[PDB]
Design a protein around this ligand. Structure first.
Ligand SMILES: N[C@@H](CC(=O)O)C(=O)O
Ligand SMILES: N[C@@H](CC(=O)O)C(=O)O
Ligand SMILES: N[C@@H](CC(=O)O)C(=O)O
Ligand SMILES: N[C@@H](CC(=O)O)C(=O)O
Lengths: 327, 327, 327, 342
């Protein structure tokens, strides 16, 4: 059908491809059993929105997704979007770390063609499974000419989230993906896309980051901030050769006497520290009296992705801080 | 005034007692400078709601609050509420770890008399500083007969939050304290309290946790869940003699192959592992195929407080799990 | 099965019983064709939670639900719950006016046995239809001993809302039912109920409202507040014999000079005016300088239901105002 | 920084040529509310407190901009009317056409700021910032929000990065688009939210963080031009609920409405009584927009129901767009397209 857009569904795994013995097992199920062609054939309506081709990239639970594999995913998506016969890509993924994978591609995909991550909170075998409609919506978004140049998108539950703002806010609910302060890029209601916002940040074709032919990324750990937080976790990260530490800080990236000592020690060894927040939302503002750089509105998981990519380009703290304010 | 309730304002510090040279310095200000009587004298209207007595317990930024000091704060509040001449206590505290301090007292205060934490996101010297109205509302709540038996409360921005549900959701905003799934116990509008909910959990006078005569707490650290999370941080926590690890997990407390190896090592050494969530909200459901216990709807910071108190009474994982479902 | 609770599924219609020719059709689906037994047979797992009996009360779209029919629904539920062989009732209903029907039964059901409204945003024939899981959850809640004495409940999307607080917040999304300030009474995750709150309001067995003998209810209309709102709509309501007007006011029930003239004319004719808010949330506080009574945190649709019932018990404005603060 | 006001001339711009020139155009609201005590948060006076008193309460504003106050009105916003909003739009267009004006901050009541702001969003023919500001507590309250909201509004209006964003509403450290922002709570400081669309930006630690640009037509790309108008079409809003009466449609028709916005049950759904009323209105040439009472989200098209659909416009916003649509057209296809694009 020469009228329809050509969409690759690049499958990585996740609960959307999860399988249990009964419709009420929504916890305990298997990931690794359902191939992309089985997902496509379960929603043949997708074939009215696009010419779809399935490609099996991986079949893992996203809690096991690693930077080396995300780097390969970015490289594969770039190869697909460089082709004239590909109009967009839908990536099926686990909900747990989709925000990390999506934000990585948001910074590194060198195309305006749509890249739409899709996931499901209930396994494919569940009663009222959300994956079928999420996939149909993701294909609609990936295939729409109006979807171009918006950055990487995450589509669940009738919502289109920017990779830069969207986060899994709830352990277990269908409506978990929200950006409380930034909203959705758009919504899909009655089989129509309603675009609301364009993000005011650099991404994709206007991003400086290009990691095509890297094979590995700088090591970055995330340490939590809390009452009685110990210095020894900084020491352990330093001893294992981290290049960056993201701090999931108390309030606005605020630091105890232990965190301060740990950050100062790490920076003396050339580790870059980003102060983010454990709160879930909002701005960590600059404070020249505290060590490290600040995460802007990046949450810890997003901040780690940006810091890893920043460290491939520079060790200059002024340049890295500007990336945190612009990406 | 024999008609008015007797309320002790027990000051611990925080931005509510923060001081800067200008009204627009909302970052960089000093905590440790402003005493409880200066806070009281800035809102003399409080003296129409109650007979207030200030007591200076500490004067620190709450990112420096520690379990030994929270233990002493619980002990002091228990001794104040045991007195016939005290009808309730307001505790001024920093926003960054108020949810940790408040939840600890929620579990350990053996009185139905109101205990109301209050804080401010802007320093006392700021333009449109929030601390004055927060304090007046906190005194109104602490003094109201209808406030008894509700568990420990956190009052900011016209809202009354339960210590068990309320969390700082935003690094930097006035409206940061929310319980997205559980709502507020009540609101204060037009100088009137509107009670909405009673928490359906054990607390205060129905809690088994009694720490009168304890001098220290079990060591519990929090490790974050993310792509490429390292096993070596579990090794470090084990080597430093932690009694508990709270895991700020991916999604519903989900664990990488590295986290699973770390948790299995910890449990072999007698460490109790609680799987919570980094997401900010919702339920980590039981899963007998994964290591450790589950945090129910307790976020990581709250889960650490309950685990520390649980470990003062038991090492039995069945009892600790039941505490996580009932407190 | 003598172990299982006896639950009646009392069907009234709604999108949960909507049927279309294709899985993607969102408009011109049919309500009125799909019987309660077809809903039950689509989720046979419900038979493992309860002994279910289907009863067809009606089969309409809830935008067509009327006070005369809600009155009969209340009467039928009271008749069912008076029976020893009924442990609870699930009521299938349209989403559009479930908050009006549910709040009416919340005030008029004279039993502590659970009454659980359930609904679906997608038709039964839709891809990823929500009705099956919503119904299974509603039966789990209605059958649980812990669910007794909580007031009337609305269950969708893994959430249990109080009839007094829950509202349809979004025209079109699955997660539409929320109580932004009051939260959910509980959630259902992994086939387990997590109760969070008990509402701090009068309902059911502690309510003064009893309609078992009534055959009609007082007339109450709702007028909107907005720039240039016309006096003539007050005149029209008065000429058509309303006994009450609920005002969906600007901000905190605020009134233009035209609305004030209309309200004064209505009150001169014995019409009771309740000032609610168009905003969606929060308290309309008392103000003796404005006409009428205030809705507390009741939104316009809920305020109308309470005013209709209040008018069966009193014409005293002091008593009606107290009802708005206590129900 | 000293107000220099000369005779038979008026007040001068501070010389500071580094700073933007910002007009603070005052209309009233609780931000200009005054009571006898700090705890009177209902019962206070609006109409007594002038724009220079607001400016003098936050002299820090003079470090962000050269500010000139202009008193446009001094009313509670529940009394704001389309004829006054029309004049406000025309005055803002006159100010922004001047080379010596870099932006305008408009002080207003919270209750109908979303209506006034959206009207100007469609009718202001400039990329220069227009920032509505309001306060939920009176100027005399303990922890009054108006001072910081005004300082934030001036910072936004003066920033070169603020241009071309549409009309903005600034309270409580947030920058909302006029098209999405609404008063969501009767009484709270954090009432202004756009649950599905978020904020355009936030102001934290004296810095603006821009997050979003709205993907809708506004200001310099809007077809709505009301310069030269002295009158606007009549549009009423009717609520949808169980037992909603047909007679309120009859009353609106008899009073010559050109439009009806329906605050519908769920997705603009209509009872048999509402359908009969809407059919009667449309037979008389009244344009009907089906919006939602819910507070959020999309009313989708449905050829089987009467009227047009509001898209994601809430009833108050839908009334403003319908009134402006009816200045230019009665074509339902054109009006529907406006609802999808504005
Ligand atoms: N653990 C699963 C969760 C999900 O997809 O919902 C994953 O992220 O792969
Ligand atoms: N760092 C401060 C922040 C605040 O109180 O707002 C504290 O927690 O003490
Ligand atoms: N119009 C339908 C909508 C739904 O149930 O979702 C009804 O309320 O009956
Ligand atoms: N009634 C006031 C309320 C406020 O400004 O907060 C107004 O809209 O003018």
């Amino acid at each position: 059908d020469d009228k329809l857009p050509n969409i690759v569904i690049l499958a990585t795994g996740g609960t959307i491809a999860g399988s249990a013995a009964t419709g009420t097992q929504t916890t305990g199920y298997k990931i690794g059993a359902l191939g992309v062609d089985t997902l496509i054939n379960a929603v043949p309506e997708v074939k009215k929105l696009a010419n779809v081709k399935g490609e099996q990239f991986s079949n893992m639970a996203s809690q096991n997704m690693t930077g080396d594999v995300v780097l390969k995913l970015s490289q594969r998506v770039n190869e697909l979007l460089a082709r004239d016969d590909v109009d967009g890509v839908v990536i099926t993924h686990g909900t747990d770390t989709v925000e990390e994978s999506a934000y990585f591609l948001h910074l590194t995909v060198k195309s305006d063609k749509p890249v739409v991550f899709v996931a499901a909170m209930r396994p494919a075998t569940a009663i009222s499974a959300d994956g079928p409609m999420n996939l149909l919506e993701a294909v609609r978004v990936a295939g729409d000419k109006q979807s171009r140049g918006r950055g990487v998108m995450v589509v669940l539950n009738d919502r289109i989230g920017s990779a830069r703002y969207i986060t899994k806010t709830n352990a277990s609910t269908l409506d978990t993906f929200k950006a409380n302060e930034e909203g959705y890029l758009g919504v899909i209601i009655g089989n129509r896309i309603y675009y609301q916002n364009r993000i005011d940040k650099l991404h994709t074709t206007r991003s400086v980051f290009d990691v095509r032919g890297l094979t590995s990324l700088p090591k970055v750990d995330i340490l939590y901030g809390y009452q009685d937080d110990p210095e020894y976790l900084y020491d352990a990260a330093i001893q294992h050769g981290v290049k960056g530490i993201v701090y999931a800080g108390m309030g606005a990236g605020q630091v105890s006497v232990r965190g301060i000592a740990g950050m100062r020690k790490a920076m003396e060894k050339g580790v870059v520290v980003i102060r983010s927040t454990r709160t879930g939302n909002g701005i960590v503002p600059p404070d020249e009296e505290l060590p490290g750089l600040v995460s802007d509105s990046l949450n810890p998981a997003h901040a780690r992705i940006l810091l890893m990519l920043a460290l491939t380009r520079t060790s200059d703290p002024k340049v890295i801080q500007e990336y945190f304010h612009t990406y």
